Short mmCIF file of all heavy atoms in Angstrom, two decimals:
data_model
loop_
_atom_site.label_atom_id
_atom_site.label_comp_id
_atom_site.label_asym_id
_atom_site.label_seq_id
_atom_site.Cartn_x
_atom_site.Cartn_y
_atom_site.Cartn_z
N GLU A 1 0.01 3.64 6.88
CA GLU A 1 0.65 3.91 5.60
C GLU A 1 -0.13 3.24 4.47
O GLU A 1 -0.50 3.89 3.49
CB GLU A 1 2.11 3.45 5.64
CG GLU A 1 2.88 3.73 4.35
CD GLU A 1 4.24 3.05 4.28
OE1 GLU A 1 4.58 2.28 5.21
OE2 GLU A 1 4.96 3.28 3.27
N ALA A 2 -0.40 1.94 4.62
CA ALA A 2 -1.11 1.21 3.58
C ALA A 2 -2.52 1.75 3.36
O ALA A 2 -3.01 1.80 2.23
CB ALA A 2 -1.15 -0.28 3.95
N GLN A 3 -3.18 2.19 4.43
CA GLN A 3 -4.50 2.78 4.30
C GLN A 3 -4.47 3.99 3.37
O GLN A 3 -5.39 4.21 2.58
CB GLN A 3 -5.00 3.24 5.66
CG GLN A 3 -5.14 2.17 6.67
CD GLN A 3 -6.03 1.07 6.20
OE1 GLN A 3 -5.57 0.06 5.66
NE2 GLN A 3 -7.33 1.27 6.34
N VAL A 4 -3.43 4.82 3.51
CA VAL A 4 -3.29 6.00 2.67
C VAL A 4 -2.94 5.60 1.24
O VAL A 4 -3.43 6.20 0.27
CB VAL A 4 -2.21 6.93 3.27
CG1 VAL A 4 -1.95 8.08 2.32
CG2 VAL A 4 -2.61 7.39 4.65
N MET A 5 -2.04 4.62 1.08
CA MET A 5 -1.59 4.21 -0.24
C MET A 5 -2.71 3.60 -1.08
O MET A 5 -2.62 3.60 -2.30
CB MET A 5 -0.43 3.21 -0.13
CG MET A 5 0.85 3.73 0.51
SD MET A 5 2.18 2.49 0.51
CE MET A 5 2.65 2.55 -1.20
N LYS A 6 -3.79 3.12 -0.44
CA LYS A 6 -4.90 2.54 -1.19
C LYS A 6 -5.68 3.60 -1.94
O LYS A 6 -6.22 3.32 -3.01
CB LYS A 6 -5.84 1.78 -0.25
CG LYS A 6 -5.26 0.51 0.38
CD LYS A 6 -6.12 0.02 1.54
CE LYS A 6 -5.54 -1.20 2.27
NZ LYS A 6 -6.54 -1.81 3.21
N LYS A 7 -5.69 4.82 -1.44
CA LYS A 7 -6.49 5.88 -2.04
C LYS A 7 -5.72 6.70 -3.07
O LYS A 7 -6.34 7.40 -3.86
CB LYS A 7 -7.06 6.79 -0.95
CG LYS A 7 -7.93 6.01 0.02
CD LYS A 7 -8.51 6.89 1.12
CE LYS A 7 -8.94 6.05 2.33
NZ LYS A 7 -9.29 6.90 3.49
N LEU A 8 -4.40 6.62 -3.07
CA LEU A 8 -3.54 7.40 -3.95
C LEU A 8 -3.01 6.51 -5.08
O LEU A 8 -2.65 5.35 -4.86
CB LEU A 8 -2.38 7.99 -3.16
CG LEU A 8 -2.75 8.90 -1.99
CD1 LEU A 8 -1.53 9.17 -1.13
CD2 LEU A 8 -3.31 10.24 -2.44
N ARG A 9 -3.02 7.04 -6.30
CA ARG A 9 -2.55 6.27 -7.46
C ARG A 9 -1.99 7.28 -8.45
O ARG A 9 -2.72 8.17 -8.89
CB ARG A 9 -3.66 5.44 -8.13
CG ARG A 9 -3.12 4.48 -9.22
CD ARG A 9 -4.23 3.65 -9.92
NE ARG A 9 -5.09 3.05 -8.91
CZ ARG A 9 -4.87 1.90 -8.28
NH1 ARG A 9 -3.82 1.13 -8.59
NH2 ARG A 9 -5.72 1.52 -7.32
N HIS A 10 -0.70 7.15 -8.77
CA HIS A 10 -0.01 8.08 -9.67
C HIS A 10 1.32 7.48 -10.08
O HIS A 10 1.98 6.78 -9.30
CB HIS A 10 0.19 9.42 -8.98
CG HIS A 10 0.52 10.54 -9.91
ND1 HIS A 10 1.81 10.86 -10.26
CD2 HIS A 10 -0.27 11.43 -10.54
CE1 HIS A 10 1.80 11.90 -11.07
NE2 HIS A 10 0.54 12.28 -11.24
N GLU A 11 1.71 7.76 -11.32
CA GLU A 11 2.91 7.17 -11.88
C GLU A 11 4.18 7.63 -11.17
O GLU A 11 5.21 6.98 -11.31
CB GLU A 11 3.01 7.52 -13.36
CG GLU A 11 3.34 9.02 -13.55
CD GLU A 11 3.56 9.47 -15.01
OE1 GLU A 11 4.04 8.68 -15.83
OE2 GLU A 11 3.24 10.66 -15.30
N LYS A 12 4.12 8.74 -10.41
CA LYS A 12 5.27 9.26 -9.68
C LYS A 12 5.16 9.02 -8.17
O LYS A 12 5.90 9.62 -7.39
CB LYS A 12 5.41 10.76 -9.94
CG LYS A 12 5.62 11.17 -11.40
CD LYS A 12 6.80 10.38 -12.05
CE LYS A 12 6.98 10.77 -13.49
NZ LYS A 12 8.13 10.08 -14.11
N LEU A 13 4.23 8.18 -7.75
CA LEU A 13 4.13 7.68 -6.39
C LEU A 13 4.28 6.16 -6.39
O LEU A 13 3.59 5.47 -7.16
CB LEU A 13 2.77 8.05 -5.79
CG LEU A 13 2.68 9.37 -5.02
CD1 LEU A 13 2.82 10.58 -5.92
CD2 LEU A 13 1.32 9.36 -4.31
N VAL A 14 5.15 5.65 -5.50
CA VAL A 14 5.32 4.21 -5.35
C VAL A 14 3.96 3.53 -5.18
O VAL A 14 3.17 3.92 -4.31
CB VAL A 14 6.22 3.87 -4.15
CG1 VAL A 14 6.27 2.37 -3.95
CG2 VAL A 14 7.61 4.47 -4.35
N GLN A 15 3.70 2.51 -5.99
CA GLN A 15 2.38 1.89 -6.04
C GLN A 15 2.29 0.75 -5.03
O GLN A 15 3.18 -0.10 -4.97
CB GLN A 15 2.09 1.39 -7.46
CG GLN A 15 0.65 0.92 -7.72
CD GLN A 15 -0.41 1.93 -7.31
OE1 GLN A 15 -0.38 3.10 -7.72
NE2 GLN A 15 -1.32 1.49 -6.44
N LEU A 16 1.24 0.78 -4.22
CA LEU A 16 0.87 -0.34 -3.38
C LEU A 16 0.27 -1.44 -4.24
O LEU A 16 -0.51 -1.14 -5.15
CB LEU A 16 -0.16 0.11 -2.33
CG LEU A 16 -0.82 -0.95 -1.48
CD1 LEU A 16 0.07 -1.43 -0.32
CD2 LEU A 16 -2.21 -0.50 -0.94
N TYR A 17 0.70 -2.68 -4.01
CA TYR A 17 0.13 -3.85 -4.64
C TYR A 17 -0.79 -4.64 -3.72
O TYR A 17 -1.79 -5.18 -4.19
CB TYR A 17 1.22 -4.81 -5.12
CG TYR A 17 2.03 -4.30 -6.29
CD1 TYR A 17 1.77 -3.06 -6.84
CD2 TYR A 17 3.05 -5.06 -6.85
CE1 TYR A 17 2.50 -2.59 -7.90
CE2 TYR A 17 3.79 -4.59 -7.91
CZ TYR A 17 3.51 -3.35 -8.43
OH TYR A 17 4.24 -2.85 -9.48
N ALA A 18 -0.43 -4.77 -2.45
CA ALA A 18 -1.19 -5.67 -1.58
C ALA A 18 -0.68 -5.49 -0.15
O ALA A 18 0.32 -4.81 0.09
CB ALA A 18 -1.08 -7.13 -2.03
N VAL A 19 -1.39 -6.12 0.79
CA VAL A 19 -1.09 -6.02 2.21
C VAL A 19 -1.33 -7.37 2.85
O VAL A 19 -2.06 -8.21 2.33
CB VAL A 19 -1.98 -4.95 2.90
CG1 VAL A 19 -1.69 -3.55 2.36
CG2 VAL A 19 -3.45 -5.33 2.71
N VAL A 20 -0.69 -7.58 4.00
CA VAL A 20 -0.99 -8.71 4.88
C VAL A 20 -1.30 -8.10 6.24
O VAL A 20 -0.38 -7.67 6.96
CB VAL A 20 0.14 -9.73 4.96
CG1 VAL A 20 -0.18 -10.76 6.03
CG2 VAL A 20 0.34 -10.41 3.61
N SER A 21 -2.58 -8.05 6.61
CA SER A 21 -3.01 -7.32 7.79
C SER A 21 -2.77 -8.12 9.07
O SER A 21 -2.60 -7.52 10.13
CB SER A 21 -4.48 -6.94 7.68
OG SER A 21 -4.75 -6.29 6.45
N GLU A 22 -2.80 -9.44 9.02
CA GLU A 22 -2.53 -10.22 10.22
C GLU A 22 -1.05 -10.15 10.59
O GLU A 22 -0.16 -10.04 9.74
CB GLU A 22 -2.98 -11.68 10.04
CG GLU A 22 -4.46 -11.85 10.39
CD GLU A 22 -5.02 -13.22 10.06
OE1 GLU A 22 -4.41 -14.24 10.47
OE2 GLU A 22 -6.07 -13.29 9.39
N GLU A 23 -0.80 -10.19 11.90
CA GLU A 23 0.56 -10.10 12.41
C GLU A 23 1.38 -11.32 11.97
O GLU A 23 0.85 -12.43 11.90
CB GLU A 23 0.51 -10.06 13.93
CG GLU A 23 -0.53 -9.10 14.52
CD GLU A 23 -0.64 -9.20 16.05
OE1 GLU A 23 -0.61 -10.34 16.59
OE2 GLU A 23 -0.78 -8.14 16.70
N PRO A 24 2.67 -11.13 11.62
CA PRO A 24 3.42 -9.89 11.34
C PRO A 24 2.96 -9.27 10.01
O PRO A 24 2.88 -9.96 8.99
CB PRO A 24 4.88 -10.36 11.26
CG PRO A 24 4.79 -11.81 10.91
CD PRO A 24 3.55 -12.32 11.60
N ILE A 25 2.69 -7.98 10.05
CA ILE A 25 2.12 -7.30 8.90
C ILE A 25 3.18 -7.16 7.80
O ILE A 25 4.38 -7.26 8.02
CB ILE A 25 1.60 -5.93 9.36
CG1 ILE A 25 0.49 -6.12 10.40
CG2 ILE A 25 1.10 -5.09 8.20
CD1 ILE A 25 0.13 -4.87 11.17
N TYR A 26 2.68 -7.05 6.56
CA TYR A 26 3.51 -6.76 5.40
C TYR A 26 2.83 -5.76 4.49
O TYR A 26 1.60 -5.76 4.36
CB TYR A 26 3.83 -8.03 4.59
CG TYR A 26 4.68 -9.06 5.27
CD1 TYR A 26 4.14 -9.94 6.20
CD2 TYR A 26 6.02 -9.19 4.95
CE1 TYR A 26 4.92 -10.90 6.82
CE2 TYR A 26 6.81 -10.15 5.55
CZ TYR A 26 6.26 -11.00 6.48
OH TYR A 26 7.03 -11.96 7.09
N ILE A 27 3.61 -4.88 3.87
CA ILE A 27 3.12 -3.96 2.85
C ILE A 27 3.90 -4.23 1.58
O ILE A 27 5.13 -4.10 1.56
CB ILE A 27 3.28 -2.49 3.27
CG1 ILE A 27 2.60 -2.21 4.60
CG2 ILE A 27 2.70 -1.58 2.20
CD1 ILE A 27 2.57 -0.75 4.99
#
């Protein structure tokens, strides 16, 4: 999910801010 959200940017799509890739993951 986060991989996809990094490439998409639009005012009508929820914006990704950051990720935590090490377990337990966070988006």
Side-chain angles (χ1 to χ4, degrees):
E1 182 191 4
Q3 299 304 95
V4 174
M5 296 183 75
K6 292 166 184 191
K7 301 180 201 171
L8 302 168
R9 188 181 311 275
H10 196 271
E11 70 176 329
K12 300 308 179 177
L13 269 69
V14 175
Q15 189 52 54
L16 172 80
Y17 291 0
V19 296
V20 172
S21 309
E22 274 172 52
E23 314 174 318
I25 298 166
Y26 294 79
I27 304 187

